[PDB]
Amino acid sequence: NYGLNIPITGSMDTVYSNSTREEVFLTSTLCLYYPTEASTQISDGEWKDSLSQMFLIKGWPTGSVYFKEYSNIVDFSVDPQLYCDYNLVLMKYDQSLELDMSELADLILNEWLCNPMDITLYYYQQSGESNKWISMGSSCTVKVCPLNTQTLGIGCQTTNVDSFETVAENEKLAIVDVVDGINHKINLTTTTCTIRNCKKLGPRENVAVIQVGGANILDITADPTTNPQIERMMRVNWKRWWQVFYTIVDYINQIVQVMSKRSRSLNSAAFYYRV
Amino acid sequence: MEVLYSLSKTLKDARDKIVEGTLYSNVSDLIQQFNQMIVTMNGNDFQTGGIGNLPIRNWTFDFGLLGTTLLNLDANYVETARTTIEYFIDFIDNVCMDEMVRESQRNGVAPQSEALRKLAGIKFKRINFNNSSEYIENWNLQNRRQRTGFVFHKPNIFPYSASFTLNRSQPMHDNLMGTMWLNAGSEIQVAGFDYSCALNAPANIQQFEHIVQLRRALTTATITLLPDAERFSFPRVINSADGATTWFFNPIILRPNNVEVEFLLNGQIINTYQARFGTIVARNFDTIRLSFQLMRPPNMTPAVNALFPQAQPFQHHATVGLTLRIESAVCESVLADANETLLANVTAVRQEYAIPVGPVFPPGMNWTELITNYSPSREDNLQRVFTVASIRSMLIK
Amino acid sequence: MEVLYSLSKTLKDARDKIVEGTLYSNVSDLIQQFNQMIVTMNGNDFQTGGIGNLPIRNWTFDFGLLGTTLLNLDANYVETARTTIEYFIDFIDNVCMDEMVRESQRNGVAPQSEALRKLAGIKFKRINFNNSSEYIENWNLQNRRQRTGFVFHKPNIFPYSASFTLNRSQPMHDNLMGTMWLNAGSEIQVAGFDYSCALNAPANIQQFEHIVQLRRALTTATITLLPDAERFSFPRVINSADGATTWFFNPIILRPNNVEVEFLLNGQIINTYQARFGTIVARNFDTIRLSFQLMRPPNMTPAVNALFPQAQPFQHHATVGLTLRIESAVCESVLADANETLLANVTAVRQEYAIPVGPVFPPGMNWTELITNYSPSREDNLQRVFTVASIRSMLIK
Amino acid sequence: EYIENWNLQNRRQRTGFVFHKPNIFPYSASFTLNRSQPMHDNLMGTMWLNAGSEIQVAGFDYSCALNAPANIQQFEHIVQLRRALTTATITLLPDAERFSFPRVINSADGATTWFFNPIILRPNNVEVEFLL
Amino acid sequence: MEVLYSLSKTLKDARDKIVEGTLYSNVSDLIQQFNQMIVTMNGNDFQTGGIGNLPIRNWTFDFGLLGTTLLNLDANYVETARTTIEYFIDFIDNVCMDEMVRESQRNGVAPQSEALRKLAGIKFKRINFNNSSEYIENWNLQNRRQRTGFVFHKPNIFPYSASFTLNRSQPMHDNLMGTMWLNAGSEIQVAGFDYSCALNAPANIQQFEHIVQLRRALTTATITLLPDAERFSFPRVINSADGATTWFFNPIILRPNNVEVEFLLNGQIINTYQARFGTIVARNFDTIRLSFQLMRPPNMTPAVNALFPQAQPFQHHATVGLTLRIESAVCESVLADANETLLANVTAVRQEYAIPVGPVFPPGMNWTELITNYSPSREDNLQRVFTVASIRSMLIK
Amino acid sequence: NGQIINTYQARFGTIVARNFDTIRLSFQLMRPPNMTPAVNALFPQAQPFQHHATVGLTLRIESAVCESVLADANETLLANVTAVRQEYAIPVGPVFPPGMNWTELITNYSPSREDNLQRVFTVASIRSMLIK
Ligand SMILES: *[C@@H]1O[C@H](CO)[C@@H](O)[C@H](O)[C@H]1NC(C)=O
Ligand SMILES: *[C@@H]1O[C@H](CO)[C@@H](O)[C@H](O)[C@H]1NC(C)=O
Ligand SMILES: [Ca+2]
Ligand SMILES: [Ca+2]
Ligand SMILES: [Ca+2]
Ligand SMILES: [Ca+2]
């Protein structure tokens, strides 16, 4: 009940001033998420200590900087937990991972509200353009079968899963969209992969996705028409992971200046599970 | 003070009508008025000034009268006329400056500047010539109070205030909604805006409203209402509500559909004009209520479609504006104008001699806080100094 | 009606010149006028009102003359005069109010308001005192048919009108060319835009022209001409001509090169100014032709070059513009202004008592529809009611 | 008043004319540039329009006071009236409007045109000095 | 109205001084006043009533003059005088009851009630006797423009408000911090509360401020300031901000430290009182700013320590309060009090006779809604009806 | 003024109107419920529709009284005025239409036009008293 109904009256001439304070932590925390390729190429192990020591001169006290190491992009896509305050995610671009990188970017860069989907019992729809179905697990093979108004599968027989239509096969993460307003019968390997009916709230701005490799390929917005260039959708050019980390450390003030510590959540999950 | 105004008026008429060669028939009545002024000011010792840097001056009057039997005035006559008129003009100038600088909280209408009180005595009522001017006539009609009125061209009734209200906001200020406005002089300029272009409003229509409370009700105001407020139709970077950060505003303007303006006097709807720009009229009002709407355009050519997306970024922000200018008006209580130099004259005489700050007026006669807080003491004391300035400007200008 | 003005003038003079202590020399001729007025008006019964909510009232005059034996006016004189004067002022106020609410499709200038019609009779022709104000002077001249002239400050000769024309159009509205204009009050803001920035135009010069017709021929008008029409110099989303879709307008303000304004009377060149901004003068005119040119700049820094390509998209849309204020003018027929409160007075008096829509005037008496169709009958009625309102404002404010 | 002043001046005396919105200023639209180069990618200076009774003056900086001392860039514009006014009422507002939308402006020499893409910041610690 | 007050005055003086056995020296002047009042009123004819259930009544005066041929008044004289006086008193009672019920949004000061309007004429100016009472003296000092003043005991200036703000809130309503206030009549009682007793506030001190803006400026007000706002010093169950739920409030009183009450006029500070209690004086003011502070005690007995934890429960809720009484005041305008009965009399007349709800006053003369919006027309009408009510109460109780 | 002043229902021949600014002729076309074979073949239920059913109304205004002045079939006032203008080739004036064609003069019959028309018609009457 933060009184989010009355307007706030400002003034257009007074003044440029300072932000007072906030007492829930001594200071914010910066938080790198890098792939194991970085460590293997660096071939070190005091290097986290050295990077912390170098952030210290940039002006981050010791306990504030944390490092996280995911196996690779697909293995990070499953339940991407951002246990932290200013998250940077170094995504090494590789050919054929364009859609998966886009999936992960659309997942973390935006604020999702997810409900459960009991696939075995009910059919499902999509309320609007902001409603996706997000499936995660060790392997998802989401076979959908759209039904007409009479609960008769069109282009598929509800009793024969072989005729169902595979929108995404064997993915660690799948943000599947289907035509809005049509019931669907879903089928996916419930032992390994789970699925959720997720609506998209506004954007999440703890997270900065740094594409380390190729050209601008991230398309967070599922709309084909729009392809916005968010300020947090960073793109750096690389030959060596030391150079990458040094650039991040050197320019970290701008990295956090383009983000906001405010849009943080209690739980570290990438969505609000609303049952 | 009627005596003061009549003194100034008869000196003006003496300087004008008493000219070489004119018929005595043209100026006989003014001659008798001038003689009355001379004989009823003779022997009276006045003192003026003594506040701030304003010097203390003594005026002693012993002047000759003006002949009557002549049929045509000549230079031998106008020379005496000017020799007296210069001294008298100086006297009224000093008296007016004295009364302008003086001030009070209790019984502001009454005359300060003890010279003016002495004039207000009963001996000097024989000078009262005729109270013709707008300000003196309003003064008399107010003194024996009937309803009266001052007519102003472009009255600076609003206090200078530029501000904004944010109905929707978040600590990154990327998707806002609200109303910017600037009330300055006789201009209102109010601009509502949606960063989402009314994407999720009911029926894709967003309502904007803005209430402006005049400190004094205006009468028979001619007003000009136009769309597309211009001061809020270019990119800006605006300090936050409290100065924490600064948020970017990138307007793209649509027309305000179904605009309406209601002119209110003590609550009730005195006038209401719907979707009617150009010149309008408010017969009597104390509050203005501008209510307009931003409607998402249902049909979008591809350029504007690219401008307004369903997604979150919102690189451009829809705006709908209104300008409302009080071209002329009639008010019970005195106000500054673009047509009359009363406020300028009083403030100039105060600043010239560095009068210490008094009880009621703001420091430096700042019009903004002199119209923001306009209590009756402020109002009637302001009327007194303004009418004295009106008297002075008849001669010293 | 001349007698009505004489009544108002003599009451104003009585209220201003019959004051305590004023000599009888100052007011002898006024007393003679007042006594004549009393003698003429005694033993008459006027009836005022009966239209809309304006209440019927009956006026009966039995007032004694004013004394003449007093050398210098005293109190009791003033109270006797005032108890007469408030009654007379109320009568004149009601007469003017009842006259301002009546129209006549045929013979507008002739009086309405049976009270005023009775005043027009031969009995009351001995009240004719003085015809000094501008409006009564022009009324007398019209009855004495010859040239009439009303001097105006910011005359709102232009009916409100915002609109555009497209000389090159596509259903996608991506490569447009044409003009937009706001004519409002004394403002003409015109802006010619070209989306291609004159690629294929002859010599990269695109000619823009705008024709404005005045409903009355203004005379000796000072006009402020500036470049860069502001209102059409920022991004905008404009409904198409038929309202089907909306197109996007993204200005880049080039200089208007070799501008040329012609002021024309009966379609012949009366005044011409090329590349001459600032204060100009139109001697006597009835239409304004504003012709300017969008000239593509041959030399460009890379920023400008990137703005204006030779290709298809045209993200930024070149434009030029002119602003033309009529600061003051002289017209042969009565108009609203930003200085006089006559339109406000008449409209307020109509709205106060809810006069039903009359034969001649538009509903609510809105100046845009009144001036856009300003037929001679409407001009007659407007002059009559404006003169009456100017008469009323002498006493009532 | 005109014959008043005629007489008062013909017989040397102090006098005056009251004007509503006098056009004391000659028409002048111009600019000065304190930082420049032939590319016109990085400029700093002032644009101004003196017109009738208006002075609309807009300082501008392409770097938004990046390398300026203390992130503050000072702008000053002096305008010298041909004849001194007296007891004037003036209206001062922010946001010089005519220089708050995109423009293409010839250079001082007129050789090439440069693009000007304003973003209206708020002028701070403004000062107005009336001199005689 | 001066005539009406003089009529009531002389009737009261007749009823009080024309008693059996008085000298004629006692009542000579009064008998002359009464006799010429009889002469003035004889031959006239008034009508009263006609609005609501107030019955119409026609008053015709034809009375004999009171004798003057006695030495000591006897019972015959007194009986005849009473036969006259009872009728005249009934007439005055009806005139005042007719004048009280009538309103006019336009020109509220002027007389409604055609009976009193006729009394305002020139024939009845000779009845004027003396204007001694406070209300009529202020009426005269406003008839001419001079500073009036009404002395009030416990003035009902504050409109009835009883409400809170929560500067910290959440749905469970378990940790709150804010202010409650009751403004009523002459009382302000404001109590700031904090559930955490200022744990995490800067320097263990929580600031509270309460601004109350009088609708009219008081003068020479005697005020009584005490700590410990009574009404917010016990358990309560209060509806939520929107009424969706209710929240428990369990005060424990702390002494408000560095309390500071400020009386302000037109923004600027007039009087300051820091850590002052008992009776104080506000010289002249328009708003009151009551600031105080909840300071967590540094040293704390184990009992109070148990009262205030650092954890979440907060079973007892710290509060600091102020009480602020206006014992007396002087006001330019007119207000109801705990002493005068004029508001009660006017409201009683309207309720008695079922007057329809008029334009200006609210229904039932509801004082809270009357003082909330106290426009100048409403104030004018209120002063008129109040002085009429006092005139009535001179004779009728 | 949009107020039904007279109403005649299925009444032909001569009728009267007290005072009227507008005439509303309403009628109907009823398919004949019974039909001789000739008319039946004339009107088929198919598409072609080779003969088209119609229903008409004629309305002469035999005489009237008008507050304003009009031309007539009985009065030579308009003819006199127009002939006098044509015989001497008067330049087209600011109020009357070119040639004084009655159709365009009564299509727009503003009060100024009515005033001038009444004046010239009365002068024509005065002249026609003598010069026929
Ligand atoms: C705001 O922060 C700046 C940072 O350099 C500091 O210099 C300034 O003093 C701060 N404000 C105040 C009021 O101290
Ligand atoms: C998915 O399809 C397989 C057959 O390929 C079936 O065995 C399984 O039960 C289906 N999953 C669900 C949740 O019905
Ligand atoms: Ca299939
Ligand atoms: Ca995937
Ligand atoms: Ca979808
Ligand atoms: Ca996309």
Residue nearest to ligand 2 atom 1, measured at CA: A187
Instruction: Give contacts of F119 with chain C, Cβ < 8 Å.
Output: none
Interface of B with C in 231-290 (CB under 8 A): 233-234, 251-255, 271, 276-281, 283-284
Residue nearest to ligand 2 atom 7, measured at CA: A189
List, in order, residues 6 or more apart from B56 with CB less than 8 Å away.
B47, B48, B49, B50
Strand partners of residue B295 = B205
* SS3 (DSSP) at B36: helix
Distance A178 CA to ligand 2 centre (A): 20
End-to-end C-alpha distance for chain F, whole angstroms: 40
Strand partners of residue B236 = B249, D120
Among chain B residues, the shortest Cα distance to A221 is held by: B311
Alpha-carbon distance of B195 to F86, in angstroms, equals 70
Element (H, E) at C260: strand C257-264
Strand partners of residue D124 = none
β B205-227/A233-235 pair status: unpaired
Strands of C5-67, DSSP E: 45-48, 57-60
Instruction: Give contacts of E166 with chain A, Cβ < 8 Å.
Output: 3
Candidate from A162, A189, A192, A195 with most ligand 2 atoms within 8 A of CB, to mutate: A189
In three state form, how does the secondary structure of chain A look?
Answer: CCCCCCCEECCCCCCCCCCCCCCCCCCCCEEEEEEHHHHHHHCCCCHHHHHHHHHHHHCCCHHHEEEEEECCHHHHHCCCCCCCCEEEEEECCCCCCHHHHHHHHHHHCEEEEEEECCCCCCCECCCCCCEEEEEEEEEEEEEEEEECCCCCECCCCCCCHHHCEEEEEEEEEEEECCCCCCCEEEECCCCCEEEEEEEEEEECCCEEEEECCCCCCCCCCCCCCCCCCCCCEEECCCCCHHHHHHHHHHCHHHHHHCCCCCCCCCCCCCEEECC
List, in order, residues 6 or more apart from E93 with CB less than 8 Å away.
E392, E395, E396
Alpha-carbon distance of C341 to B154, in angstroms, equals 12
Distances in Å between the Cα of A27 and the Cα atoms of A22, A59, A61, B365 are 9, 11, 8, 49
Instruction: Give the amino acid at B63.
Output: F
Buried residues in B185-212 as b, exposed as e (16+ CB within 10 A): bbbbbbbbbbbbbbbebeeeebebebeb
Closest CA to C308 of C242, C252, C363, C267: C252
> Atom of ligand 2 at shortest distance to CA of A162?
5
Chains B and F touch (3+ CB pairs under 8 A): no
Residue with tokens 């879709």: C245
* SS3 (DSSP) at F21: coil
Q: Is residue C237 within 8 Å of residue B307, measured between CB atoms?
A: yes
For residue E79, the number of C-alpha atoms closer than 13 Å in the C-beta half-sphere is 3
B153 assigned ligand-binding residue: yes
Among chain B residues, the shortest Cα distance to A223 is held by: B311
How far is B73 from chain C, CA to nearest CA, in Å?
19
- Interface check for D119 against chain C (CB to CB < 8 A): the answer is no
Strand partners of residue E158 = E185
Q: Which chains touch D (3 or more CB pairs under 8 A)?
A: A, B, C
Crossing angle between the packed helical segments B376-393 and B2-17, to the nearest 10 degrees = 20
Element (H, E) at C323: strand C317-331
Chain-chain contact of B145 with E147 (C-beta, under 8 angstroms): no
User: Across the C/F interface, how many CB contacts are shorter than 8 Å?
Assistant: 14
- Interface check for D94 against chain B (CB to CB < 8 A): the answer is yes
- Interface check for E372 against chain B (CB to CB < 8 A): the answer is no
List, in order, residues 6 or more apart from A80 with CB less than 8 Å away.
A104, A107, A108, A270
DSSP state string for E4-64:
HHHHHHHHHHHHHH--TT-BHHHHHHHHHHHHHHHHHHTT-EEEE--STT---EEEE---P
**Helix and strand element counts for chain F (H, E):** 4, 0
> Atom of ligand 2 at shortest distance to CA of A164?
2
Alpha-carbon distance of E359 to B265, in angstroms, equals 12
Alpha-carbon distance of C134 to C138, in angstroms, equals 6
Residue with tokens 């409604």: E112
DSSP state string for B269-332:
EEEEEES--EEEEEEEEEEEEEEEEEE--SS--HHHHHHS-SSS--SSEEEEEEEEEEEEEEES
- Angle among Cα B208, B214, B220 to the nearest 5 degrees reads 100
Distance A166 CA to ligand 3 centre (A): 9
- Interface check for E213 against chain A (CB to CB < 8 A): the answer is no
Closest CA to C162 of C144, C185, C145, C132: C185
Chain-chain contact of D101 with B234 (C-beta, under 8 angstroms): yes
- Interface check for C156 against chain B (CB to CB < 8 A): the answer is yes
β B177-185/B158-168 pair status: antiparallel
Q: Burial of C211 by CB count in 10 Å (0-12 exposed, 13-18 middle, 19+ buried)?
A: exposed
DSSP state string for C345-375:
HHHHHHHHHTPPP-SSSPTT--HHHHHHS--
Strands of chain D, DSSP E: 25-35, 44-52, 54-61, 103-106, 113-116
Among chain B residues, the shortest Cα distance to D88 is held by: B344
As for ligand 2, residues whose beta carbon falls within 6 Å of it are: A 119-120, 161, 187, 190
Strand partners of residue B206 = B294
Alpha-carbon distance of E341 to E345, in angstroms, equals 6
Alpha-carbon distance of B65 to B83, in angstroms, equals 12
Q: Is residue E174 within 8 Å of residue E312, measured between CB atoms?
A: yes
- Angle among Cα A58, A60, A66 to the nearest 5 degrees reads 115
Chain mean position to CA F50? 33
Crossing angle between the packed helical segments B75-101 and B2-17, to the nearest 10 degrees = 150
Candidate from A161, A164, A186 with most ligand 2 atoms within 8 A of CB, to mutate: A161
Chain-chain contact of C336 with B228 (C-beta, under 8 angstroms): no
Q: Is residue D71 within 8 Å of residue D124, measured between CB atoms?
A: no
Element (H, E) at B37: helix B24-41
- Interface check for D111 against chain C (CB to CB < 8 A): the answer is yes
> Atom of ligand 2 at shortest distance to CA of A190?
13
Alpha-carbon distance of F50 to F72, in angstroms, equals 42
In three state form, how does the secondary structure of F67-106 look?
Answer: CCCCCCCCCCHHHHHHHHHHHHCCCCCCCCCHHHCHHHHH
Distance A196 CA to ligand 3 centre (A): 24
Chains F and E touch (3+ CB pairs under 8 A): no
**Helix and strand element counts for chain D (H, E):** 1, 5
Q: Is residue C63 within 8 Å of residue C84, measured between CB atoms?
A: yes
- Interface check for C298 against chain D (CB to CB < 8 A): the answer is no
Alpha-carbon distance of F105 to F92, in angstroms, equals 13
D20 assigned ligand-binding residue: yes
The two tokens of residue B327 are 């071209």
The two tokens of residue E295 are 């300071």
How far is B235 from chain D, CA to nearest CA, in Å?
5
Chain-chain contact of B376 with E332 (C-beta, under 8 angstroms): yes
Q: Is residue B388 within 8 Å of residue B93, measured between CB atoms?
A: no
Chain-chain contact of B224 with C21 (C-beta, under 8 angstroms): no
Q: Is residue B318 within 8 Å of residue B194, measured between CB atoms?
A: yes
Alpha-carbon distance of D114 to D62, in angstroms, equals 12
* SS3 (DSSP) at E181: strand
Strand partners of residue A70 = A35
Residue from D122, D125, D126 whose CB has the most chain A CBs within 10 Å, to mutate: D122
Instruction: Give contacts of F114 with chain C, Cβ < 8 Å.
Output: 106
Chains C and F touch (3+ CB pairs under 8 A): yes
Q: Is residue C284 within 8 Å of residue C220, measured between CB atoms?
A: yes
Q: Which chains touch C (3 or more CB pairs under 8 A)?
A: B, D, F
